[PDB]
Design a protein around this nucleic acid. Structure first.
Lengths: 104, 153, 45, 193, 67, 119
RNA sequence: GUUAAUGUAGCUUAAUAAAAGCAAAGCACUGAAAAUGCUUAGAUGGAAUUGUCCCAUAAACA
């Protein structure tokens, strides 16, 4: 019994608009499914014309949940969008102040 | 962390208000200080929903409601319950009948005649000057025949 | 179904006018895309 | 006791269905706002190119319109997912069954599941297993028996021997109920998409 | 204007249609989750001991990419 | 000349009101109340009431908010409640429906601000 | 037929003095989300009384 690592998704598509929507769209599914999404970063343009890719940081997953979720992604996948799933690779005043007490 | 977060001021506000009303172990501020009718109603709702013009006016935010009809309906349907409160609020029950409560039923109507056809309706909590009430008012309550009654001011 | 997110309005704050064109793929599939120029179709080489 | 394992294969749909007419009108509206928020003879050449697209045959959204009966072919459907489904004959039964193979407790579900992929299809199909958790278990008696229904996805498939003597059928949902009457075999839809 | 009113009317059809789709998809997930949970329960009756190994996640499953 | 609570400086909203208007937008319904400091409601107008519904197209609507305000005013006029206190939130105050509702109350003559106490 | 389920709208042991509250959808909004504004949808297939029958339905026995 182990907990899945955080796996990012790079939604590579010709048009960012469609890519963003799917990213936003799948994120809505993620939030409903109780999947935490830390970031929605995106890659730059693929200069040669160009394409567009959207990062989707998916964090937290389970074995039974993994099987259903990824298959759902295939169906959700909109027109001409290339999926990807990969394992992932300034603190403010309250955070630092709390940190001082812990190690003091 | 298990429980979700309100994420909205309004949701927290409503939850807080309810808790204050509920009794608590610790001291708090408050301590110190038939079926056929339902089917008929649904049928009317569907008819109103079906009306495209009603929807058209609503989506144009031009529609309005006739207060006159609602007022008569309010008196017949649920007005007495509200009428009981305004009697409780002013303390009528706790004064006339030492705390005994009687629900009003007959939609009684009173008005003071002023010179001509300008009647001042005497509702609950209304403000009427002594000058206008120099003479006795007209009372109408649709007692129906064979209905003995008595009136008191 | 892919149709769930297939239809999405442009959310970019400011953009130039884009017309629809089909990028025909080498496997015979086609995808609708938005292109500035009034082209009609695109072919994957 | 009779130990029997089985696999409920899944083939992803390659090409989606056409959009509904109400989807079309919404598609028009989003274009209209796009024009509003837009900023600022090659047309003849593009028109020459568009007819070149029309004359050149593109890959059909559903490759069953030409076939119309190729249940044995891997590309039975494109709009929806497909499930491997092979007629089988048992000692006391002759029923249309999900692909089955013999499993042992020493062999894990995936190991038997992997064998099911190529044992009954005898092809260079590519499929993937996600979780060791099985998806169905049904017991039919005449002698006790139990069949384990697994789930798998087809990454890709080069289905050699399209015209097998076997009755392997790729079905999404229509042929599930038609060929599999009993709940022990007609309830596969519960864990099917 | 009136054209905007017609555009609003189709939005009512479209917004209602999407809400119906959402509810349909949500119920589909519920049946899928129930079936997956039901699939978990079925073999548990046959042998709970087998699941103890099976319920453990597969570390090598990912990365998995499919278009 | 009666007393009004003047404390609660650190809490929102202030309670220096003889009467208060609470407008609650539920998922399908909008309700309006008038309540004294002691907590007894005096005038209540809700879209759940049968009489309003039969003449009201949709319980939750800007027109419904405007219409319910008109009904509440007449009842408030009936009870003799001429001066009242309304404490909206910033977003609620900016809401068009609430602005429309206050417009109806102003037309009816119900004052949304009470006068200061006499010492 | 025996065991067993399942019967206000996703949820509620809301409601019999008035079919409610919450969840949920879409649109506007642009980092994403959330919030906010404008909007959308629905039920007692059913009787008991507290704070089991009942027929229907659908299963193991059959």
């Amino acid at each position: 019994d182990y907990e899945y690592g955080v796996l990012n998704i790079h939604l590579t598509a010709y048009d960012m608009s469609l890519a963003e929507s799917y990213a936003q769209y799948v994120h809505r599914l993620c939030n409903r499914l109780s999947i935490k999404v830390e970031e929605s970063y995106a890659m730059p343009t693929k200069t040669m014309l160009t394409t567009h890719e959207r990062v989707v940081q998916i964090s937290g997953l389970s074995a039974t949940f993994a099987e259903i979720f990824l298959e759902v992604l295939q169906s959700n996948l909109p027109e001409g969008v290339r999926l990807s799933v990969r394992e992932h690779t300034f603190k403010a005043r309250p955070e630092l102040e709390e940190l001082l007490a812990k190690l003091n | 962390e298990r429980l979700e977060k309100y994420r909205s001021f309004e949701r927290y506000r409503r939850r807080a208000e309810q808790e204050a009303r509920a009794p608590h172990w610790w001291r708090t501020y408050r301590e110190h200080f038939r079926t056929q009718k339902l089917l008929e109603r649904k049928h009317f709702l569907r008819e109103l929903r079906a009306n495209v013009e009603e929807e058209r006016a609503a989506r144009l935010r031009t529609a309005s409601i006739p207060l006159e009809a609602v007022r008569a309906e309010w008196e017949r349907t649920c007005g007495p319950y509200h009428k009981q409160r305004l009697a409780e609020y002013y303390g009528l029950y706790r004064d006339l009948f030492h705390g005994a409560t009687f629900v009003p039923w007959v939609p009684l109507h009173v008005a003071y005649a002023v010179g001509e056809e300008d009647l001042i309706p005497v509702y609950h909590g209304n403000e009427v000057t002594p000058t206008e009430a120099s003479r006795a008012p007209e009372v109408t309550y649709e007692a129906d025949k064979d209905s003995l009654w008595t009136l008191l001011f | 179904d892919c149709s769930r997110a297939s239809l999405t309005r442009l959310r970019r704050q400011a953009y130039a006018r884009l017309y629809p064109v089909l990028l025909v793929k080498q496997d015979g599939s086609t995808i609708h895309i938005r292109y500035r120029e009034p082209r009609r179709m695109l072919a994957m080489p | 006791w009779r130990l029997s394992g089985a696999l409920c294969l899944q083939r992803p749909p390659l090409i989606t269905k056409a959009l509904t007419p109400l989807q079309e009108e919404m598609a028009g509206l989003l274009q209209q706002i796009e024009v509003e928020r837009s900023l600022y003879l090659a047309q003849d050449l593009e028109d020459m190119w568009e007819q070149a697209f029309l004359q050149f045959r593109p890959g059909a959204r559903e490759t069953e319109a030409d076939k119309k009966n190729d249940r044995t072919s891997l590309h039975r459907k494109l709009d929806r997912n497909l499930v491997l489904l092979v007629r089988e004959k048992l000692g006391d039964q002759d029923v249309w069954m999900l692909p089955q193979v013999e499993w042992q407790p020493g062999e894990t579900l995936r190991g038997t599941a992997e064998r099911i992929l190529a044992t009954l299809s005898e092809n260079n199909m590519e499929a993937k297993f996600l979780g060791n958790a099985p998806c169905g278990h049904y017991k039919f008696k005449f002698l006790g028996v139990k069949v384990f229904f697994f789930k798998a996805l087809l990454l890709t498939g080069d289905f050699v021997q399209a015209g097998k003597k076997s009755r392997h059928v790729w079905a999404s949902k229509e042929e599930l109920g038609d060929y599999l009457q009993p709940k022990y075999l007609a309830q596969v839809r519960r864990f099917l998409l | 204007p009136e054209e905007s009113e017609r555009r609003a009317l189709l939005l009512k059809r479209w917004a209602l249609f999407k809400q119906q789709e959402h509810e349909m998809e949500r119920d589909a997930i519920r049946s899928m989750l129930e079936a997956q949970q039901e699939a978990l329960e079925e073999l548990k009756l046959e042998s709970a001991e087998l699941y103890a190994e099976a319920i453990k996640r597969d570390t090598s499953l990912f990365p998995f990419e499919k278009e | 000349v009666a007393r009004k609570e003047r404390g609660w400086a650190t809490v929102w909203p202030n309670r220096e009101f003889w009467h208060r208007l609470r407008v609650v937008k539920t998922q399908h319904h909008v309700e309006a109340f008038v309540e004294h400091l002691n907590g007894q409601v005096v005038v209540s107008a809700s879209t759940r009431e049968w009489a309003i519904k039969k003449h009201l197209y949709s319980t939750r609507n800007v027109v419904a908010c405007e219409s319910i305000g008109r009904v509440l005013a007449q009842r408030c006029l009936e009870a003799g409640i001429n001066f009242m206190v309304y404490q909206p939130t910033p977003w609620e105050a900016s809401s068009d429906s609430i602005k429309r509702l206050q417009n109806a109350m102003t037309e009816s003559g119900v004052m949304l601000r009470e006068p200061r106490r006499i010492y």
